[PDB]
């Protein structure tokens, strides 16, 4: 017998403290605000990019992958296998939506620590990645040059737009068929007689209320209201969902509790295409709510982002 527990894992804590360590060497803030005291330093802009990672047990230990269809996420597995390192993972620090991760071969898989506990998040892993296109346009600087006889060649540079305003695109049709699929797995978990509803985030720090993430060394915040508004019966056919975003300088650190401020955006264009691999959900029941369950976007704890991709692994001693 070999019991697994993704929620009381220790690779999840190990990787967490490592990924944080990466940032604090490859991404310096112009001023950080922690423990009351404040430090300001020069901050040369750099193109940070999510670079693949293999978790590797030390000399004398082995990792164990469980390859069972529709895995509980916890509890004894049968078709286990030994490894040395984990298949490359992309350390995506993001909320509301998990990006560039592994998917299910079969159907959608909702996993949780406690389903009945409405304070516990619901890791929803997709079986078919939805594509999202985020980008800050090069709309802003209006340069031009006068060409003519006897004309000298200078260039007139003046900015006319908000250099911080971006947007993302999603396939309306894909996303709709995606939600309707999660609601199916939820109904087959809380009851068929139950009704399903998605509703936006309740409130809190910017990073949580709005699907945040990093791209091209810049911090995005995307008003994901269009995303999570669906009542089963409610750009109707085949169009293109687009949501508003904004680059911010003043972000609240995820590493520890506090704020940090970075340099303004860099000239040019900023574009990232990523796979929506899964979503962090959260539930809310109040002593029986008539007969209908609502679901909001979650996220904010990065141990969750890790756990979604380490749920099959367990490190063990080879004595």
């Amino acid at each position, epitope marked *: 017998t070999e019991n697994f527990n993704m929620w009381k894992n220790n690779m999840v804590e190990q990787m967490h403290e490592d990924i944080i360590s990466l940032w604090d060497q490859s991404l310096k803030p*112009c*001023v950080k*605000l922690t423990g009351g005291s*404040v*430090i*300001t*330093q*020069a*901050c*040369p*802009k750099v193109s940070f990019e999510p670079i693949p990672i293999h978790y590797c047990a030390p000399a004398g230990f082995a990792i164990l992958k469980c390859n069972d269809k529709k895995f509980n996420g916890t509890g004894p597995c049968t078709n286990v296998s030994t490894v040395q390192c984990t298949h490359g993972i992309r350390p995506v620090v993001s909320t509301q939506l998990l990006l560039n991760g592994s998917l299910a071969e079969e159907e959608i898989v909702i996993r949780s620590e406690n389903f009945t506990n409405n304070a516990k998040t619901i890791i929803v892993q997709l079986n078919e990645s939805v594509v999202i296109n985020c980008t800050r346009p090069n709309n802003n*600087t209006r340069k031009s040059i006068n060409i003519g006889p006897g004309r000298a060649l200078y260039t007139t540079g003046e*900015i006319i737009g*908000d*250099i*911080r305003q971006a947007h993302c695109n999603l396939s309306k049709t894909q996303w709709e068929n995606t939600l309707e699929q999660i609601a199916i797995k939820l109904k087959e978990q809380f009851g068929n007689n139950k009704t399903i509803i998605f509703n936006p985030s309740s409130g809190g720090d910017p990073e949580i209320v709005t699907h945040s993430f990093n791209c091209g060394g810049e911090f995005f915040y995307c008003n994901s209201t269009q995303l999570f508004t669906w009542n089963d019966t409610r750009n109707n056919t085949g169009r293109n969902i687009t949501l508003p975003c904004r680059i911010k*300088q*003043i972000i609240n650190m995820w590493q520890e509790v506090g704020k940090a*401020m*970075y*340099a*303004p*955006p*860099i*000239r040019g264009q900023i574009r990232c295409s990523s796979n929506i691999t899964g979503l962090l959900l959260t539930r809310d029941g109040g002593k029986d709510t008539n007969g209908t369950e609502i679901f909001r976007p979650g996220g904010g704890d990065m141990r969750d982002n890790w756990r979604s991709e380490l749920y099959k692994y367990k490190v063990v001693k080879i004595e």
Partner: antibody
Amino acid sequence: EVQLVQSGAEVKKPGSSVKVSCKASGGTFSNYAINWVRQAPGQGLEWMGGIIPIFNIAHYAQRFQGRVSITADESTSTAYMELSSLRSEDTAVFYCASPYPNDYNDYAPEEGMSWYFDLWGRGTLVTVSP
Amino acid sequence: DIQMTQSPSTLSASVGDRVTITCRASQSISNWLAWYQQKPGRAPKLLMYKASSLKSGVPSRFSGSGSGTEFTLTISSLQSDDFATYYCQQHDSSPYTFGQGTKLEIKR
């Protein structure tokens, strides 16, 4: 133009307090990061404290922790730096320096954030005599 | 905290003569330095920022060089309007430290 205006010459007997001013003639106030710098007679430059452009946060050197308080008056677009408990050694000149006010809607420099002082107050001498 | 040190303290320099000033740090601070000129009884004014980058409205005879720990302020030709004191600031991290000071005088 875009200069910084400082208040006049102050004369204080030990044990009192004085609050110096510093107006921003041009540009936009929220773009300025006004840091105060001290220079004692026949002595070199010494940094004192400053505000954080988009924070309102004011941080000071350890030497001047519980003695100085730098405030910012948005209405009149003026920055103030009061100094409590005056002694004889604080006789000095207090400039208000500040990196050029680049518009908030502007692509980032290569320095990331400019902590060098582009603009300087004319000079405010403060003598502490009985 | 970072300790700044200039050289030399006093400088008996002639006219037109090419001269270089140094400034060494307590740690590696990249290329984040700045040189200030200050005439007697007057507010200091910035010439060189970014360790070597000149600023708009600054003469061409002034040349900043170096990086890491050792830095240099070089002057090609010398006029009668360059006999002031010079300070090195380090706009790397707070607290921002300045230089000791070097008085550029005349020789006879």
